Amino acid sequence: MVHQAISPRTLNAWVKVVEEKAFSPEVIPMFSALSEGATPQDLNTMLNTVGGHQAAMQMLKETINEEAAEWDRLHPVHAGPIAPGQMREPRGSDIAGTTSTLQEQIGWMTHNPPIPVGEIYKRWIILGLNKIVRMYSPTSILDIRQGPKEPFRDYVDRFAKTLRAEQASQEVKNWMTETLLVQNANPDCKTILKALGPGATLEEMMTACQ
Amino acid sequence: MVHQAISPRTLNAWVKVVEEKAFSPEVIPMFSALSEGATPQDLNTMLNTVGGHQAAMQMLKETINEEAAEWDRLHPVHAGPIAPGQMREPRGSDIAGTTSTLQEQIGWMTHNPPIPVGEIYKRWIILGLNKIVRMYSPTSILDIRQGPKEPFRDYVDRFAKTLRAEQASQEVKNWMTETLLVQNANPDCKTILKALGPGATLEEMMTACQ
Amino acid sequence: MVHQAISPRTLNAWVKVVEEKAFSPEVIPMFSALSEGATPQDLNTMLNTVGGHQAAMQMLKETINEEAAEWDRLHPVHAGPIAPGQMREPRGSDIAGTTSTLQEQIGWMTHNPPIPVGEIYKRWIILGLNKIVRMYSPTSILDIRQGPKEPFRDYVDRFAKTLRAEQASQEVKNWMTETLLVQNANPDCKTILKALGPGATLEEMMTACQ
Amino acid sequence: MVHQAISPRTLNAWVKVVEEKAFSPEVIPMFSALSEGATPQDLNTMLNTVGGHQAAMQMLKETINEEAAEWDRLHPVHAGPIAPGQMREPRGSDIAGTTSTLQEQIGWMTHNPPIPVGEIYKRWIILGLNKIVRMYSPTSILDIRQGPKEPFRDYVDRFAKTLRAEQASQEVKNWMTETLLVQNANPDCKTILKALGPGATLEEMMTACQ
Amino acid sequence: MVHQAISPRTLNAWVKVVEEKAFSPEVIPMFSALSEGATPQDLNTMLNTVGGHQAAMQMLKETINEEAAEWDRLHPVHAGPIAPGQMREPRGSDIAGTTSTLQEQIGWMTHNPPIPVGEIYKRWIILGLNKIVRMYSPTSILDIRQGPKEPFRDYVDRFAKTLRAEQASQEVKNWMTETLLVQNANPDCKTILKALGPGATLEEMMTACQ
Amino acid sequence: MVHQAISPRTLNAWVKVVEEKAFSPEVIPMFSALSEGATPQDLNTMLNTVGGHQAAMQMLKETINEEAAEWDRLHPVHAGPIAPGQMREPRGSDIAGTTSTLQEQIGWMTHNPPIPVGEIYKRWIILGLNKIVRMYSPTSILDIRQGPKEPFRDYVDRFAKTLRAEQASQEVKNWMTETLLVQNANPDCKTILKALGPGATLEEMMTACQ
């Protein structure tokens, strides 16, 4: 038997928090939707589909891990004959979706009485993320303006990565880049540069500032 | 069998030492009181609930474990077959928490004579914390005074993460923060600040620093 | 026995990207052409034939891995004891181009109705690369001007190293090299060269630059 | 002979030597005195109760290890089935005070013929210690001094930990500390301080030194 | 055919490339000619006799290794229960020189039809080396021409050690050593030296340069 | 022959070079003389007794290792059903004295026909040592001098350990120390010292020379 489930549109939504808010806590419903209990697999999905903050993947992942520890700790994995293939008291693996893999899992989860794993596990998540908001704390390019006595060259270079590393829109990307570049030379260099007025390729201007 | 047990209010208490004093001594006699001998699990709890001085648990835990070693060293269970004596006794691992199952703790504890698992373990702990106290010393954001030649630019960072690492009223936190920022400027940076008089976004100030 | 295919000429084709403009993201539809869905051995081939940009490969390989993981994840590897072999539910490794003998893989691809690994795997490939190109962002010996406080010797070191790393005719290589060495001096270093006017082996000039 | 044995007072004494002369060689006749025979378990004790010179423990420990090596080297268990009457021949671990219960130690020692565990081990011990004395050589908080271009913050830090790291009254510790801070300042720094004349929170002075 | 075989005179020859041009790309076809197609011990021999460029040993060695891989890849072990061994299907290892005692390896070459490993292995090798010439790219003590703003003091030290690292006649070594040391010397350092005129032990001169 | 042989005098001798002038390669015909080809245990002994250039032991050990490889390489094992225990295709381990401990070893060595391991092995030694001599090239404390810009404190430190790390007489140790510190000192520092004229412990002067 198979119920119909989780669209990729809904994924698109999940995605969409990322797409809105890739690495920024304007999260709340998005989680709430995604925390429609879920199983591992979906949850696994979200975390699979997750990017942005590897560190966040981390943060949860310890949290989870100790949640697992806690699971075993609050339920020290009590053995038996496992008469009619039970629930196999959830671990980190289960939290991976492994141990009564998803059908079977859901099978526990909507085993009635349940063993509704992804939700428990969900509590594990549930445990991190907020704190993740509490944890993660951006980020910004603008300040990539050249250091105190930082040299230019690097400054643009750095900048160059950083712009590489920055957001969407080529158009923006070009013009902004000059436009933000300007001040991202540090004032003194920028002043030289301003004193250059224009230039084109970096390099000549730069060449002055090396 | 059940017995009713430890609250999370009691946790709130454990907490109460902790939010009282997450990174320093003078919270202790009362916590030590509140460490009513313990079991592994409560100790585990404490350890679960543990944080603040990452070193503190860290040094303690080895010590605890070497306390286990010492246990082993003064007896590791130099023995074999059994009719589960002294609530089927433990080794260092149980004393680590480890190979105690829930029962085994309780069992050990209220078996008569017991095995005072959490108490030994407690003693191990008991062994550390004091030292922790005995030497463990915080630390502050205030210190992000711009010591010898620190440049404000870093500083802004220095604060900014540190501030990130700083807490409570954010509102408060700013105003003092600027006001303490000025302070934590090195006089010369401070000068730039004085010389800035007012600013707002960092950057213009930063620009003075860049 | 074969349904005869591929060649090193077709490799010359794979190659054809690479030497043509290996960093030519612009090559991908051609590649997509040369990935005629791709079998594991050809996919293996491509990765075998792979070279020059391991960073890119690196990124990719992660995807492949993630793909593998994903495969098992998104196809829970819900195998058990076989009955007439059936290409044994490909794992990440098979998908790595590993498990199943190459024919047998292939066999699976041309199994009717296949176990056609190589496409999936192809998507894996696709899964890195495209993006990988899409931000895999070079590189250049020209960029090796000369730092702010970078002196020539080091510049030679760089330049020359990079030059070591640079391609083409030696003849080219020299002349540009003076001329671009010229250019890629830092302006002051550039000055020393300008101030040097001519010279021959580096060293004497260089000697000025030490 | 479920005997009578070494006290913690006597331990206290050994320990006391450490407390006497924590990092100072001139222990030795006592050392030999508490070395008197020494069971491996007591020898374990000495190393157990050991602390404050991990380098020493370390350095010794290679000797021990070599001593084990040597043990096997000068006698590599050239044996097969232990017949009755042998108090099981030691190896490096036993000689480490490891493999054995006390009995096996004593059994080896006062099994007559013995196995003179504690003595061998004693040579081992001796083997570190000698060197240890012979080279080991502190340390000094005075050296928290602000060296050549050393600057203050660090100097105080240096003070702060180090003074923290030092022994005795806090009271003492302060007054000397100012009195020792002052001058261990590099002169130019000392001077700033002299030029500060007095001060109180470090920071204003320090701020001057930033 | 348990013949007479390869001399060390032939080694002297292998050597002859090597002392001729030990860590430089241009001695080689003439050596490859002198490879005379080598089999494993001999290939090993070359590897045995190999030295100077561990990185080269490396460079090849990846090639070998991937050659092995390729090998494994292109020999996706079709091996099963061998019917009378018949110079047993190589694996990377054989090709590493690893598999088979040498005769049998040799047999594997010189059997007729052979299963000549050593040629393949030779191919592997053959596969690196060229590229090694393509890879490796010298080398020179002269290049201990003094840095830009760095002291002599090291510069000579560095030299001196480099000189350690340098080879040939000592006699030579001195005079050049002053004579190029004088030179290596940054002009400014060199000048100090010139200004030193003579000296004898380094040190007094050095002493001027410290 | 449950023989009578070797000496700590023989050691004393072994020592005598080492201790005479361990970094005088000028020891070598004697040392090899003192080798008399030997066994593992004595050679091991020599190697046990070894100390001074860690690196030396290392490099030899590297040699040994490769010698072991060579042993197998030039004669792998080809082991099957040993008849009368034999000399069992010795390796690095045998060279350790591992495989065939000394009695049995010697038993092979004076097994007639022999298998005189320590000699082979001796050739392994023989294989290193030379290099060791030929490259191993000290060392010298004098060269601790107050840098080019390395400062005194460190200089004296550097000195201080190092002198500690240096040889001989206490008397000497005092006098040199004044005399050899003063001036090893970069001139400019030496100047401060000259400018100190005298002082007493370092420190006052150093505290001045910071």
Short mmCIF file of N, CA and C in Angstrom, two decimals, chain C residues 101-102 153 206-210, chain E residues 76 146-149 186-188:
data_model
loop_
_atom_site.label_atom_id
_atom_site.label_comp_id
_atom_site.label_asym_id
_atom_site.label_seq_id
_atom_site.Cartn_x
_atom_site.Cartn_y
_atom_site.Cartn_z
N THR C 101 30.69 -6.31 -13.35
CA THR C 101 31.78 -6.26 -14.30
C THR C 101 31.33 -5.39 -15.39
N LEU C 102 32.27 -4.75 -16.06
CA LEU C 102 31.95 -3.67 -16.94
C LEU C 102 30.96 -4.07 -17.94
N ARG C 153 61.91 38.76 -6.40
CA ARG C 153 62.47 37.46 -6.39
C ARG C 153 61.48 36.39 -6.35
N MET C 206 67.49 41.34 -10.54
CA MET C 206 66.94 40.69 -9.40
C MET C 206 67.70 41.09 -8.22
N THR C 207 68.98 41.25 -8.42
CA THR C 207 69.93 41.61 -7.44
C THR C 207 69.62 42.98 -7.07
N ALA C 208 69.16 43.80 -7.99
CA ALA C 208 68.67 45.10 -7.62
C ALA C 208 67.41 45.00 -6.76
N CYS C 209 66.69 43.91 -6.93
CA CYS C 209 65.41 43.72 -6.33
C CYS C 209 65.49 42.95 -5.05
N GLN C 210 66.72 42.58 -4.73
CA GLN C 210 66.99 42.12 -3.44
C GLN C 210 67.74 43.32 -3.02
N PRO E 76 38.69 -6.06 -15.29
CA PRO E 76 37.75 -6.08 -14.20
C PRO E 76 37.61 -7.51 -13.79
N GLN E 146 70.43 35.96 -2.39
CA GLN E 146 69.83 36.44 -1.24
C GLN E 146 68.48 37.05 -1.45
N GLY E 147 67.64 37.03 -0.45
CA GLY E 147 66.33 37.54 -0.62
C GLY E 147 66.33 39.02 -0.78
N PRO E 148 65.10 39.49 -0.85
CA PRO E 148 64.85 40.87 -0.79
C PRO E 148 65.01 41.27 0.60
N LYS E 149 64.04 41.81 1.32
CA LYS E 149 64.47 42.28 2.60
C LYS E 149 64.64 41.27 3.66
N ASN E 186 72.30 40.02 -0.80
CA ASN E 186 71.53 41.02 -1.45
C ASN E 186 72.35 42.21 -1.68
N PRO E 187 72.23 43.12 -2.57
CA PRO E 187 73.21 44.11 -2.97
C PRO E 187 73.57 44.85 -1.81
N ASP E 188 72.61 45.12 -0.99
CA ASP E 188 72.80 45.79 0.20
C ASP E 188 73.60 44.91 1.14
#
